[PDB]
Amino acid sequence: NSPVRFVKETNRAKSPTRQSPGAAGYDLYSAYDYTIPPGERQLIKTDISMSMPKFCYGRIAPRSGLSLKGIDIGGGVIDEDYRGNIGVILINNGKCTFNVNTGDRIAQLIYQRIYYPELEEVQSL
Amino acid sequence: PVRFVKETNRAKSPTRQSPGAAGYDLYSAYDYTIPPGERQLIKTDISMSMPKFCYGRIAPRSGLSLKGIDIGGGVIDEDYRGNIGVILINNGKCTFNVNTGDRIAQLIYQRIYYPELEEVQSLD
Amino acid sequence: PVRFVKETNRAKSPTRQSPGAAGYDLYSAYDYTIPPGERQLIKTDISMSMPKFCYGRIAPRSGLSLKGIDIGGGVIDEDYRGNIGVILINNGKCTFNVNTGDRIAQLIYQRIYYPELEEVQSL
Numbered sequence: 001n002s003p004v005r006f007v008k009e010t011n012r013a014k015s016p017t018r019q020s021p022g023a024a025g026y027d028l029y030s031a032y033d034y035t036i037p038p039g040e041r042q043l044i045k046t047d048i049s050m051s052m053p054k055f056c057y058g059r060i061a062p063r064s065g066l067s068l069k070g071i072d073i074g075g076g077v078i079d080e081d082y083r084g085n086i087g088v089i090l091i092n093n094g095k096c097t098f099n100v101n102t103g104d105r106i107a108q109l110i111y112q113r114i115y116y117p118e119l120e121e122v123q124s125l
Numbered sequence: 126p127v128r129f130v131k132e133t134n135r136a137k138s139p140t141r142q143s144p145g146a147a148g149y150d151l152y153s154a155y156d157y158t159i160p161p162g163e164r165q166l167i168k169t170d171i172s173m174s175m176p177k178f179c180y181g182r183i184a185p186r187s188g189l190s191l192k193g194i195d196i197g198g199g200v201i202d203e204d205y206r207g208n209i210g211v212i213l214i215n216n217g218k219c220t221f222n223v224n225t226g227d228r229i230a231q232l233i234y235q236r237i238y239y240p241e242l243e244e245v246q247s248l249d
Numbered sequence: 250p251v252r253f254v255k256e257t258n259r260a261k262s263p264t265r266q267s268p269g270a271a272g273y274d275l276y277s278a279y280d281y282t283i284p285p286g287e288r289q290l291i292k293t294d295i296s297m298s299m300p301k302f303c304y305g306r307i308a309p310r311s312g313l314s315l316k317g318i319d320i321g322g323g324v325i326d327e328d329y330r331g332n333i334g335v336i337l338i339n340n341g342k343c344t345f346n347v348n349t350g351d352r353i354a355q356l357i358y359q360r361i362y363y364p365e366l367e368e369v370q371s372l
């Protein structure tokens with residue numbers, strides 16, 4: 001249980017942070033400026049890449065404030081071996097246009113602990 | 126032992142019905158009416174002191190999901206000590222009614238990890 | 250070790266793609282058609298024994314998510330012993346086709362906790 005290394009791809013990226021010592025996840029921020037109209041989704045870029053911890057995955061989880069405004073998360077499974085610019089799919093299920101500015105908090109990345117079992121085909125259980 | 130508090134007598138204590146259930150059932154404490162394409166914050170009138178290296182996920186019941194009732198948000202932080210609400214998204218075509226005492230979700234205590242983040246020049 | 254059963258020959262063994270993959274790939278055992286703004290329970294014809302202190306999350310493939318396809322429900326409990334279903338929701342603008350054998354989701358074995366609850370008067 002050592003440090004998770006992350007790379008800022010550009011000067012626009014903000015280091016992920018936990019609000020509080022008991023916060024579930026690390027907050028992710030838009031590196032660019034977007035307009036999402038009602039009934040549309042947009043992949044938002046963080047310009048962050050990280051080497052993910054072992055036996056875990058990163059859940060791109062919703063911030064509750066944005067969810068009460070009708071902003072949900074699409075996809076959001078960051079694999080252990082994924083090394084690219086992390087992106088967040090924001091779904092505007094609200095009634096009017098939602099603006100994403102550079103620096104805006106858009107989601108929380110939770111390091112969810114997972115198992116990698118062997119699968120064995122059987123006749124019955 | 127996770128301690129919990131009822132804000133009112135209207136709160137139902139979260140239930141666990143079998144050893145192989147993913148978590149605990151959450152129940153509405155109030156009456157609600159959610160029109161099609163609209164979301165509503167359902168108050169459970171339960172607050173709790175959450176265990177270490179976990180978050181509580183407000184997770185969907187399959188039966189409601191199958192009716193087009195999805196879960197908004199739902200990340201209960203370890204140090205969230207307020208009234209637990211369930212954002213129900215009515216993605217069906219009919220008005221969805223929530224009565225006091227109705228099962229609305231399952232709370233799942235999800236084991237997580239809190240790494241230190243160290244910025245580096247490059248990974249690989 | 251997890252034991253799984255193919256209910257029909259139309260079922261495909263769940264596989265991980267890479268050693269660092271989060272979930273095991275789930276496939277449609279049948280043909281489906283999903284209208285925009287509608288959902289569909291997809292049958293995998295795979296039933297399995299879930300590990301202890303765990304639940305399977307039916308999680309999205311990010312590629313389908315970019316096309317507007319999302320996952321409904323998806324909590325596979327430890328004592329669920331039936332055909333694993335996948336609720337795909339078509340939140341795109343056009344009809345969605347599912348062909349027998351298509352990759353529809355991934356299953357993530359998510360470690361959980363079964364704590365005791367105790368009512369108190371304050372925290």
Ligand SMILES: [Cl-]
Pocket residue numbers: 059112182235306
């Ligand atoms: Cl999850």
